[PDB]
Every structure is written in C-alpha cells, then in structure tokens.
Design an enzyme around this catalytic site. Structure first.
Site, PDB file in Angstrom:
ATOM      1  N   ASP A   7      -1.885   9.792  -4.675  1.00  0.00           N
ATOM      2  CA  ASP A   7      -1.295  10.036  -6.001  1.00  0.00           C
ATOM      3  C   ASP A   7      -2.422  10.088  -7.058  1.00  0.00           C
ATOM      4  O   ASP A   7      -2.869   9.056  -7.556  1.00  0.00           O
ATOM      5  CB  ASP A   7      -0.267   8.946  -6.347  1.00  0.00           C
ATOM      6  CG  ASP A   7       0.472   9.203  -7.658  1.00  0.00           C
ATOM      7  OD1 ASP A   7      -0.043   9.953  -8.510  1.00  0.00           O
ATOM      8  OD2 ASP A   7       1.571   8.632  -7.842  1.00  0.00           O
ATOM      9  N   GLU A  42      -1.982  -3.769  -9.881  1.00  0.00           N
ATOM     10  CA  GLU A  42      -0.998  -2.686  -9.904  1.00  0.00           C
ATOM     11  C   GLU A  42       0.350  -3.176  -9.336  1.00  0.00           C
ATOM     12  O   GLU A  42       0.674  -2.896  -8.186  1.00  0.00           O
ATOM     13  CB  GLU A  42      -1.517  -1.489  -9.099  1.00  0.00           C
ATOM     14  CG  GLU A  42      -0.874  -0.135  -9.438  1.00  0.00           C
ATOM     15  CD  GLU A  42       0.148   0.330  -8.414  1.00  0.00           C
ATOM     16  OE1 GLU A  42       1.303  -0.151  -8.480  1.00  0.00           O
ATOM     17  OE2 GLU A  42      -0.199   1.181  -7.557  1.00  0.00           O
ATOM     18  N   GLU A  93      10.715  -5.222  -6.447  1.00  0.00           N
ATOM     19  CA  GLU A  93       9.765  -5.933  -5.570  1.00  0.00           C
ATOM     20  C   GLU A  93       9.324  -7.283  -6.155  1.00  0.00           C
ATOM     21  O   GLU A  93       8.714  -8.095  -5.454  1.00  0.00           O
ATOM     22  CB  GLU A  93       8.523  -5.075  -5.270  1.00  0.00           C
ATOM     23  CG  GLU A  93       8.850  -3.734  -4.615  1.00  0.00           C
ATOM     24  CD  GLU A  93       7.615  -2.860  -4.385  1.00  0.00           C
ATOM     25  OE1 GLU A  93       6.478  -3.389  -4.412  1.00  0.00           O
ATOM     26  OE2 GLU A  93       7.780  -1.626  -4.225  1.00  0.00           O
ATOM     27  N   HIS A 147       4.453   9.142  -7.710  1.00  0.00           N
ATOM     28  CA  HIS A 147       5.249   8.679  -6.576  1.00  0.00           C
ATOM     29  C   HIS A 147       6.386   7.723  -6.982  1.00  0.00           C
ATOM     30  O   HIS A 147       7.203   7.347  -6.142  1.00  0.00           O
ATOM     31  CB  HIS A 147       4.333   8.017  -5.526  1.00  0.00           C
ATOM     32  CG  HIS A 147       3.845   6.652  -5.909  1.00  0.00           C
ATOM     33  ND1 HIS A 147       2.832   6.451  -6.824  1.00  0.00           N
ATOM     34  CD2 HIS A 147       4.216   5.421  -5.482  1.00  0.00           C
ATOM     35  CE1 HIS A 147       2.613   5.153  -6.956  1.00  0.00           C
ATOM     36  NE2 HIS A 147       3.437   4.507  -6.149  1.00  0.00           N
TER      37      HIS A 147
HETATM   38  N1  LIG Z   1       2.190 -12.664  -3.763  1.00  0.00           N
HETATM   39  C1  LIG Z   1       1.227 -11.793  -3.233  1.00  0.00           C
HETATM   40  N2  LIG Z   1      -0.005 -12.278  -2.894  1.00  0.00           N
HETATM   41  C2  LIG Z   1      -0.934 -11.490  -2.402  1.00  0.00           C
HETATM   42  N3  LIG Z   1      -0.728 -10.182  -2.209  1.00  0.00           N
HETATM   43  C3  LIG Z   1       0.485  -9.611  -2.525  1.00  0.00           C
HETATM   44  C4  LIG Z   1       1.514 -10.407  -3.054  1.00  0.00           C
HETATM   45  N4  LIG Z   1       2.581  -9.584  -3.272  1.00  0.00           N
HETATM   46  C5  LIG Z   1       2.241  -8.360  -2.901  1.00  0.00           C
HETATM   47  N5  LIG Z   1       0.977  -8.356  -2.431  1.00  0.00           N
HETATM   48  C6  LIG Z   1       0.227  -7.245  -1.959  1.00  0.00           C
HETATM   49  O1  LIG Z   1      -0.132  -6.472  -3.124  1.00  0.00           O
HETATM   50  C7  LIG Z   1      -0.293  -5.110  -2.682  1.00  0.00           C
HETATM   51  C8  LIG Z   1       0.393  -4.233  -3.591  1.00  0.00           C
HETATM   52  N6  LIG Z   1      -0.065  -2.749  -3.561  1.00  0.00           N
HETATM   53  C9  LIG Z   1      -1.575  -2.689  -3.404  1.00  0.00           C
HETATM   54  C10 LIG Z   1      -2.240  -1.357  -3.628  1.00  0.00           C
HETATM   55  C11 LIG Z   1      -3.608  -1.554  -4.269  1.00  0.00           C
HETATM   56  N7  LIG Z   1      -3.431  -2.003  -5.596  1.00  0.00           N
HETATM   57  C12 LIG Z   1      -4.314  -0.206  -4.237  1.00  0.00           C
HETATM   58  O2  LIG Z   1      -4.552   0.414  -5.390  1.00  0.00           O
HETATM   59  O3  LIG Z   1      -4.620   0.259  -3.137  1.00  0.00           O
HETATM   60  C13 LIG Z   1       0.433  -2.136  -4.759  1.00  0.00           C
HETATM   61  C14 LIG Z   1       1.931  -1.967  -4.707  1.00  0.00           C
HETATM   62  O4  LIG Z   1       2.566  -2.275  -3.677  1.00  0.00           O
HETATM   63  C15 LIG Z   1       2.661  -1.404  -5.932  1.00  0.00           C
HETATM   64 BR1  LIG Z   1       3.846   0.080  -5.496  1.00  0.00          BR
HETATM   65  C16 LIG Z   1       0.322  -4.998  -1.283  1.00  0.00           C
HETATM   66  O5  LIG Z   1      -0.710  -4.737  -0.340  1.00  0.00           O
HETATM   67  C17 LIG Z   1       0.957  -6.296  -1.043  1.00  0.00           C
HETATM   68  O6  LIG Z   1       0.793  -6.655   0.294  1.00  0.00           O
END
Ligand SMILES: Nc1ncnc2c1ncn2[C@@H]1O[C@H](CN(CC[C@H](N)C(=O)O)CC(=O)CBr)[C@@H](O)[C@H]1O
Ligand SMILES: Nc1ncnc2c1ncn2[C@@H]1O[C@H](CN(CC[C@H](N)C(=O)O)CC(=O)CBr)[C@@H](O)[C@H]1O
Ligand SMILES: Nc1ncnc2c1ncn2[C@@H]1O[C@H](CSCC[C@H]([NH3+])C(=O)O)[C@@H](O)[C@H]1O
Ligand SMILES: Nc1ncnc2c1ncn2[C@@H]1O[C@H](CSCC[C@H]([NH3+])C(=O)O)[C@@H](O)[C@H]1O
Lengths: 343, 343, 342, 342
Positions: free
Chosen positions: A31, A123, A132, A280
């Site tokens: 994206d 993010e 979420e 997205h």
């Molecule tokens: N409490 C927590 N502690 C640690 N990690 C956590 C968490 N809650 C979620 N996460 C983790 O945060 C991530 C969220 N996405 C990561 C993409 C990253 N910012 C990028 O640009 O590549 C971005 C996304 O999902 C938004 Br659509 C995911 O990998 C998830 O596993």
C-alpha cells in the site's frame, strides 16, 4: 496483565497467528500511500528524532524503525508479539543496524524497557479506526514517555455522513429471501425468515463508492492521543446533527478517518476519505433495515455508540431520526464479521 | 470426552462459531448435486427406512432427518453441537414432526441416547475426504448401531493421479520474488526470500481443472465404514504404482473422492471426480518441490502418508520415484491452511 | 333470464356503460391484426355465407355484419345490448343496407328471433380467452342454429408454459415493502406486511415479453364450440405435465390463446402468441409468491383450476410440483383486477 | 342522509376502491399533504391537549395517531370501507387501545356517545368538491360543542382564464378518425359530430406552466365553522377578470387551498400551480369556442356547480368580454374525467 484481562485467548491466538504470515506483511507493505506518507512524516520532522530515544509499538516486519533510524535516532526499541519478530531480527542483521535497533519480543503491556523515551511511533488504526482495539495498547505505552515527549501520530479525526444506495440494499435483501421458501425439497423454511434478515443486516459493508451518494456535509469526532486515557475507549459516544442538502431516501451512514503527525517543523496528514486515493482500509458503510425519507432543509439528528467486547472489537449501536417528522431508525452492527464486497 | 481430548479449545471455538451462521447452512443446502443424491439414495431404498429407528450425526438445519421422515421412518434422533441446534428445533415444530424427530444439542461423543438404532446417516466429508476430521465422529457413533445394522454412506473411495501444469508451478516464484530487492524505501529485503518460497509450497491448492492434464489411470484407496474403527483414521498410508500413458514432466499429484450408498433395493453413487459436474468440494492438488520427467511406458512408484494434527486437520507427506531412471522427489504439506485459487 | 342469474346488476351496468363510448370502439377498430383477420376469414370462405341466413352475437359498431353482407349473405340479425346500438343503426342507414342487416337491441338470452340460422358469428374472447364470460352467450345462441349449421370461430386453443423473470418479481416485492416500515412519521406499520404481499401477488400481469424466458414446450387445452355446452364453462380444470428444457428458477406461468375459422374452402387462424405480432390482448402472466428450482430433464406437473364468479370473471387456482424432488407451489389469483405494466 | 342522495351502484364501487391497501399507500406517500397535516396538528398543541376528538373517515388511521401525539384525551375513528378491519389491527399493535376506538360504518348512521371539542378530516376531491365527502364533514357538526373548532377551518377555490392552442386542437385530431369513406369498406363519417361532442364534455386532469394564465385569480371561500350541508348542493361562482395580457382565451383553470386556524398559529395547504405538485394535480375546462381579449379589458360571467346522484357534479360555464360583447359557454360531467398527464 492489562491485555489478558480484556481479551479472549481464542481470539488472541488467531489474531497473532494471522500476522505471522509473510504474505500479509507483503500485502501491507504494497500500500504505497501508507508507506510513503509515514516516511514523509518521519523524515520531514527529522529534528524530533535526531539524537533521541524512540519506541515503536507493534513493529511487524520493522519498516518504521528503519525510517526512524534513517532520520538519525540514537536508539530504537521495537516491540512485537507474533513470530514475525524472528523475521525482523534477520533484516536488522543483514542491514547492519545492530547498534541502533533492538527487537524485544512480547506484548507492550508485559515487557520491561531500560529507559524512558522521547517519542512514540505506531500504526494502530483498524477499520473505522477503532477495530482490533490496538489503540488501547498505544496509549498504555505512554507509561514510558517523558513529560515533554511526543506521539506520532498525534491526533485522529473520525468522519461521518448519510448516504443513498438502492442497489446495495436489494442485494442483501435478496440473499435473505432464501429462508422464505414454503417447500425446499418438501421442507418449509419460512419460520426462520426473520432471523436471516437480522443476521445479514448486522454485517458492515467494506468497499469504496462515488462521492455523489452523500446527502449532507460530514460530522467530525476528534481524539487527542497526547491527552487521552486508555479507559476512555471502553465506551465511545458520538452525537450528530446533519443539515440535509438533498431530498431522498437515506439508506444508512458512511464512515472514514484521518490522522495527523504534529512535528516541530511541520504537520503531516494521512487520510482515507472517498475524495482521496484508495488505501487498503477503503471506507465503511452501515445500512438501516428500513430507509428514512428526508427533504432538503430538514435536520437529521442522533447518536452512534461503540462498546468494546472481549473478541477484540466493538458492538455498534446506531440511532437516527428526522426531526421534522419523527421518523426514527435503530440498528446494531457486529464489526467482527464484515462483508467484503469489493471486486 | 474423546473429542476434547483430540482438539485444542481455540480451534473448536472458531470451528463451531463458523457453523452457527445461517448463511453457511444456506451455502451447503444450495449445492444441488450434494442434496439431491442424498434424497434419491434414501427414498429409492425405502425398505431400509420404513418403521425403523434412525440416527442423524450432525444434523445442522435438519434436512437429512426430514428426508428420513419422508421415507417412512418411525423415529429419528438428530444431534447438533453449534447454536444452529436452536434453529433446527424451530423447523421441526413448524413442520408438524415433533412426534418423530428429536433434536439433541451437544457432541455426539458426550450426549446420551435412550435406545439402539437400525441405521446411521451423516454428511461428514471434507476437502480430500478427510479434512476437518469429522469422519472420526461418524464411526464413533457406531456404539449405538444394532448388530447387522447399516450405514449411509456405506463405503468411501479416495482417488490419486499424477499431473502436469507449468503455469501453476511458475506462479509461486513470481509471488515470492517480491522479497528479492535491495532498496524498498531504502531497506534491503532479500534475506527473507527463501522463507517466502517455502511458505507458498506448503499450501494445498483448491480449484478445478481440465482432465487432459492427467497422465495415468488413477489409483484407488477404499474405506469400508461398516468395518473400520476410529483409530484407523489417525495414520493413513497409500502406496502407488502408475503406468504412464503420456510422455512429459510431472509437477505433482491430484486428489478427488466418491462415496456409495448400498441399500437392499439398489446402490447409489455420489462422485466429485473431474469428469463429473462441479461441487463445493472442487478438487485438490499437491505440488512436488521439483518436477519429474517420465516417458510413456515407464512406471512411477511411491507413497502418500496422511498424519492427523491438533488443529483438526492433517500433515501430508508425499514421496515419489521413476523406476526406470531413479529420479526422485518429495513434499510435506499443511492442509489446515489451503490456498483458494478458484476464480 | 340466464344472464341476470349469473351477474350482479352493479357490475353489468358499468360493463355495458363502458362499451357505450365511441372512443373505446375507436380503440378496438384500430387493432389491425384483429380486424383484418376476421375479414379475411369471412371473405375467403364466401360460399358458407352466399344466400344464407346469419346471426351476429354482440355486434357493437356493426363491423362484422358489414363483412357478412359483403360475402353475399341474404339476411343478418345483429344483436347488441349497450347504447352503441343507437349508433349502429345510423351506419346501417348511411350505407344503404336496410334490406339486409337488421339491428335488434337487447341481450341474446332475452330477445325473440323470427327464424333459425345457417351460421353464427361473434368476437367473444377476453384476457386469458375467458375473461368477461361472454363465451357462455356465444354457446347459448345455438338454440337458433339448424342441425348441420356452422360457427365462426369454430374452435379455441389455450396454451400454457413456465417462465423465469427476476426483475418483475422484485418489482412487485419492492412495492409491498412500504408496509414494512417501523416508524412512518412515528407510526409502526409492520403488522400488515403479510396483507400487502397477498394483495399485490394476486394481480395478474398484463404485458408482452421475449420468448427466451420460457422454460418448456407449451401445453394445449382445446374447446370445440360445435359440441360444447354452456354449463361446461362454469368450472374449467386443466392438468399439465412439462418436460423441462432448461435449468433454473421458475417464477410463474405464462398464458395465451388461438382461435380457428374452419370453412369449406379453407381454415384460417387468429393467434395471440408471443411469437406473433402484438394485439390489444397482449399476454398474461401469473407469479408465484416463491419461485421453484428445476433442472433440465425434470418433469413439472400439476393442475390449473378456473371458477366463474358473479363479477363476470374468474377465480384462478394454480398448484405445481417438481416430480423428482417434491418441491411445491400453490397460488390464488383474481382476474378481475389486473396490473397494467406496459 | 347518505343513502337518499347516492345511487347504490356508485356507493359500492366507491367504498370498494378505498378498501385496497395500495390506494392508502398511494395517498400516504404524498409528503406535502401528510406533513402539512402533521405540522398543523402538532404546532397548535394547546388545541388538542386533554381534548375529545373526532376523526371523520380515518382510512388507515394515520390522522388519529397525529391527534394522539398532540396529547388528545380520547379519539373516535369512523370508517365505512373494509379498511376498518386493518385500522383496528394498527391500533392494537401501537398500544393505543385505551385512547383510540375504531367504528365501522358511515358517519350518517353510526352513533357517538358524546360531544367533541374538535373534528379532523381529509375530504377534498378534484377542484375541492368532487366525491361529495365535504357534506359528510359538515354533517358531523351534530356532534360538535358550540365552542369547538374544525381542522381544516376554511377552504378557498380559485379560478383563472388560460390560453393553450395545442390542447384545443387535440380533440378534433382524435374525432376525425370517423371522417373517412372506406374503413375496410364501411363509411364511418356519419358519427363524427357525436365523437367531437363526447370529448369536450370531459374535464382535463393534469398540470401546466403558469405562463399560460392571463389574469389574477378569483377566489370563492367556504367557512366550515359557519356553513351548512345544504350550502353545497348548488354552488354559484360569479367572476370579473381584469386582463393582464392580450390574446385568445380557450377556457378556465381550477385549484384550491385549505387553512388550519389554531390558537397559536394559522397553517396553510395549497394545490396552486406555483407550488410543488400534489396527487390532486389541477383541472381545466374548455370553451366550445375561444374568445379574444385585450390587456385592460374585463371578462365577466358565471360558473355554476350542480350536485348529482353519481357522487359528483355537473359543471356549467358562461363567459363574455364586456368591451366587445363576444360570448361563449360549456357544460361538463366531472364524474368521468380525461387523464392526460404524461
Ligand atoms: N499488544 C501488542 N503487543 C505487541 N504487538 C502487538 C500488539 N497488538 C498488536 N501487535 C502487533 O502489531 C502489529 C500491527 N501491524 C504491524 C505492521 C507494521 N507497523 C508495519 O508497518 O509493517 C499493523 C496493523 O496490524 C494495523 Br492494520 C502486528 O504485527 C501485531 O502482531
Ligand atoms: N349478452 C350480450 N348480449 C348482447 N351484447 C353483448 C352481450 N355481452 C356483450 N355484448 C356486447 O358485445 C360487444 C363486445 N364485443 C366486441 C364488439 C364487436 N364485435 C366489434 O367489432 O367491436 C366483443 C369484445 O368486446 C371482446 Br374484447 C360489446 O359491445 C358488448 O356490449
Ligand atoms: N462431533 C460433533 N458433534 C455434533 N455435531 C457436530 C460434530 N462435528 C460437527 N458437527 C456438526 O455437523 C455439521 C456438519 S455440516 C452438514 C450439515 C447438515 N448435515 C446438512 O446436510 O446440511 C455442522 O453443522 C457441525 O456443527
Ligand atoms: N360517509 C362516510 N363514512 C365513513 N367513512 C367515509 C365516508 N365517506 C368516505 N369515507 C372514507 O373516508 C376516506 C377518505 S380518504 C382519507 C383516509 C385517511 N384518513 C387519510 O387521510 O389517509 C376513505 O377511506 C373513505 O372510505
């Protein structure tokens, strides 16, 4: 921990397993609006990062920590709970940044950091911004922030507006009519007609649309991430009063969101509006089971209420009325089970 | 229970939530091949049902019980574990059949029935026949069947054959090579390419195809549901020897299945072969890591081993060799996470 | 009389009042297929009229009697119950035919004629052939026919076939949903939704259509006017068994009809089929409240039952099943109140 | 009183018509009508709070619910068609059985138990008076207290002269169908004159551009608080127009307003051609011969409305140009109008 108290294990397992696949990272990275806008925001305010300490909440593949490293940050702590954490470490080594980026596996609600930080990056936005429930993890991390530190993104704006769309409404109604049959292979199904309509109409519709379907100027709800508390997000109440610009049938409400990065040198915006190039996240629409007729000049008033649940999402209640006639509508949506209509 | 002992909770929750949706029942009911053949099989062998006691394992909406009621059955016990059970009760009442059909909410391994039955009916087939592991529940129920009782379906045949498809094979590298680039927004991603390739090849491919891609007559493996025990499905070993009818490169193995209803009046067949009209099961293909060359007249020999796992699915191990040449290939796949390619 | 016994006064008044307007006659005369086929039928069989005595049942403007006079008839008795009768006499005089056409005002069930006739003519066909119940009057007139006499038209064929059309179904479903509203200016209407659906679907749809919507070869039901009796038309039961040529959803049944003129020189046909040029009768379709799924090769069997009522029309009952599956539909329609969609 | 003044055949069809849910639906979807009634009732809330109310001809019941919203203490809802069974259903499902009582029958024949503070109704037809329901509205005042009010309180009928060459010309084009010597061999011309006459006797229902109007309208006012039923049997409307424009006058155009006069404010409902269209549209009546007039001249004459037994009116119009003495007239039957709207 604070995370485990509010979350079903079953949901969390599936949630973090989902994000362990490389193909989803690939899908996210591609994206360009997103990735480019984040890089623009970090590099153009480089004095907010130069020789500073940084925290990246939920780093995934690690891309944002790399941007902070490019702007001259002295030390970056990168927290990640899925197995992707092991793939992130590989990239840190093959890119020769072991002296600056430190991967810490685990949940931010559970790990220990060595020092307080000057600025936080993340993010955490989902569908309709709030899906979420990751925003709660973002605010919690403020326990590590210095009295004069900053947050990137700094604020979030949610936008709402009424729409008209006959074709979408009939499409969903047609599916429900299966349960109307008096003799399917000799069996009468009709007693379940009511239950089927309710189920289909509780699904939010994810896709994009032409801006000419909007019937009034949008309403704004603002969250300031520097000031807000975690507890603030368990119950979110959004009132509205629209001045109708066109006459017709209102079939429901459309939603989208903006975020702002407020730095020392300049402010940078990221938007998912239907007037802007597609991301997205698309946009989100909630249908009424029965549409409301309104004339130009009338006022449409009501409330949108979001209550968090233990499957990491929200129960949504929407109530609306046309003030001049008393025609009223109410509906319930389950943000957990959306209908993906696009292409 | 015997069920909870073989299933992680997280998996079971999502599994039974999935089947609680009416749209999901509707989808299965609208497959005409599926629903019509069951009805013909039950009605054309009416002497196997009139004034008999019947068991329906996993009734969902209840449709099969209604077919048994049409054939003149005296009593039907209908067992169902998801919330769909509450809806099935509604339909029995509105169809005036409370005196003959009894709905029982719960697991077939844990509920109690009051009496022995003359015949068992069920629809437990998944992808590649065995996916979702419901066939173990069907056989377990034989604890309630009278000596010399009957089973509908009575036998199951799984079929295997070798195929050629250059484009499908080529697609996986095209996708994985995204990670092979030195400066994605200033970041070098290449170190993760190998892992990405591996991830893609572990997925079985779900769709259909032209029969002209088949290179030899199929090999058949048969399960007799009257004789088999539950434990027989934990480890399934299928040896093969193909006599090649065409010259070329073999890229992998294709799978489909048949079941037969053997009644007192006649035998009825239900088939998902690529020579027959399409069903919601499609067909399944598993790739070799490297293709094998064979000329017409050569022999291709080896083994397919299926091992049950804790996510209600199977680990698949495939080993193959060309006897005249000694050319050898293998693959190991995870059926829980298939790639849905159909368009 | 036989007419007054089967008809409410209120209906008949409006009925004969309707036909008293010149504008409606103008509408009927301008259907060229209609007017041309009758003239062709009479003139090409001119030997069946030459020097004969003729009866015209329900002459209206008088047009058919002029055709009979052209073919060489010796004497024509023209019966008409509406006030159009005053206008027909005007045309008889201005065309100098007083020696050959005799107008008799009144109902055919009630007037007295001076002699028996050699041949009878009429145009008594309505929507679905049978609407308006005039066919009973046509048969009643045989009391005046000589033993070896003839009838023009001689026979009538009704045709039936199954169709698919989702948009019409949704169009009718859309209107009823008004009564689904929980808060119309603050009022809950939903308790009547069921009443609204029933009312809308009881209306037969009058219009035309592309023949490709048909799912099987038609079934034919024949009435022979030389042999049939009046009483035969009080209750009409038509059984059917279709062999399905296409797979899909059946949304209802389509109807049309043919009539034949069997003369000594040649047989002439008048048809309202969807394969033929449009007439003012168009075609008629009856919807199911819920559609039936069928496959190619299956058989669709059942019965169509027609019951005459006192408002000069019919109560329609249709029941149908797919034999291989046991899927069934049943419905009731009121031919008196159609939906004009064209 | 109802049965003496209406032929039965007419009453049957009239009450049958309103028994269909679709017609109620059709009336309810006119937003101007329903919204203006609702606003008039709610903005004058001091006129309804704790009062006894009568709803004359409630149909679906929609107006009684408005009376309920405004705080009425008790409502009697009278209805003569079968819609009455459905109104009872809605009262029950909206939990208002303690305040609204449905009464099947005609207001001239049913019995009410007590006097009321206020009467509400919607009895207006084409050009206000068609359908003759206003006489029932005035008849209901036998149940009204001396110091009670009526909603609506007054009615205004408006008249103005128009020019429209194409409409006048259309009638001859249609009639000249009969002016031909050999339609399939028959001479039709003798009936042409009768055809022309038939068309001009029909009032035309539709809308039009306001620029065809040639003078400011004349107004005739009925005060429902003061008027008696008998006042509506013979309605004589004199007129004197001061011409604003020069040209040919082809006839007269009609529309109406009603007013709700409450203690807090007066609310108006208008069907003028300067306002948004309603389901009443407008009505035009032709002169048999057009009249030329100059700007500044005066056009004087009379419109006389005579009630008949088919629940409608015979319309008589006479007109003259005072400065020239040029004169014209026409007589029309409002019961059978021509629907022209496209
Ligand atoms: N409490 C927590 N502690 C640690 N990690 C956590 C968490 N809650 C979620 N996460 C983790 O945060 C991530 C969220 N996405 C990561 C993409 C990253 N910012 C990028 O640009 O590549 C971005 C996304 O999902 C938004 Br659509 C995911 O990998 C998830 O596993
Ligand atoms: N029992 C009766 N006795 C005498 N006259 C009767 C009658 N029933 C009906 N009629 C009269 O028959 C006429 C109807 N037919 C058409 C008129 C005539 N054939 C023509 O060419 O215009 C046929 C038609 O309209 C089918 Br669409 C009408 O004028 C009607 O009043
Ligand atoms: N062990 C079990 N005990 C009870 N129900 C089960 C079990 N395993 C699966 N099911 C149910 O069995 C159904 C299989 S799907 C087939 C549904 C139905 N027989 C039809 O023909 O439409 C699902 O609804 C599951 O929830
Ligand atoms: N004499 C009468 N007595 C009772 N009802 C009548 C009488 N005359 C007419 N009506 C009814 O009055 C109604 C006029 S239409 C108004 C209907 C409804 N209140 C609405 O405003 O939506 C019709 O339903 C007629 O059947």
């Amino acid at each position: 921990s604070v995370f485990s108290e509010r979350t079903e294990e079953s949901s969390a397992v599936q949630y973090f397993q989902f994000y362990g696949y490389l193909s989803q990272q690939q899908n996210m990275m591609q994206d360009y609006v997103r990735t480019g806008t984040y890089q623009r925001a970090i590099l153009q305010n480089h004095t907010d990062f130069k020789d500073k300490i940084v925290l990246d909440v939920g780093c995934g593949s690690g891309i944002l920590s790399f941007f902070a490293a490019q702007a001259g940050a002295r030390k970056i702590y990168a927290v990640e709970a899925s197995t992707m954490a092991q793939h992130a470490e590989v990239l840190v080594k093959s890119n020769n940044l072991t002296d600056r980026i430190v991967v810490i596996p685990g949940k931010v609600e559970e790990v220990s950091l060595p020092e307080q930080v000057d600025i936080i990056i993340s993010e955490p936005m989902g569908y309709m911004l709030f899906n979420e429930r990751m925003l709660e993890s973002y605010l919690h991390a403020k326990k590590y922030l210095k009295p004069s530190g900053n947050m990137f993104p700094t604020i979030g704006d949610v936008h709402l507006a009424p729409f008209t769309d006959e074709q979408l409404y009939m499409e969903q109604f047609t599916k429900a009519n299966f349960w109307y049959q008096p003799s399917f292979h000799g069996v009468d199904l009709s007693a379940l007609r009511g239950a089927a309509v309710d189920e289909y109409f509780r699904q939010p519709v994810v896709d994009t649309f032409d801006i000419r379907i909007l019937m009034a100027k949008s309403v704004k709800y603002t969250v300031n991430f520097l000031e807000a508390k975690e507890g603030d997000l368990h119950r979110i109440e959004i009132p509205f009063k629209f001045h109708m610009l066109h006459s017709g049938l209102v079939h429901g409400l459309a939603f989208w969101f903006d975020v702002a990065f407020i730095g020392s040198i300049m402010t940078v915006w990221l938007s998912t509006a239907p007037t802007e190039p597609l991301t997205h996240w698309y946009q989100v629409r909630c249908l009424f089971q029965s549409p409301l007729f309104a004339k130009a000049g009338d006022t449409l008033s009501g409330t949108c209420l979001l209550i968090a649940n233990k499957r990491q999402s929200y129960d949504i209640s929407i109530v609306a009325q046309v003030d001049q006639t008393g025609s009223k509508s109410s509906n319930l949506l389950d943000l957990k089970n959306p209908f993906f209509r696009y292409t």
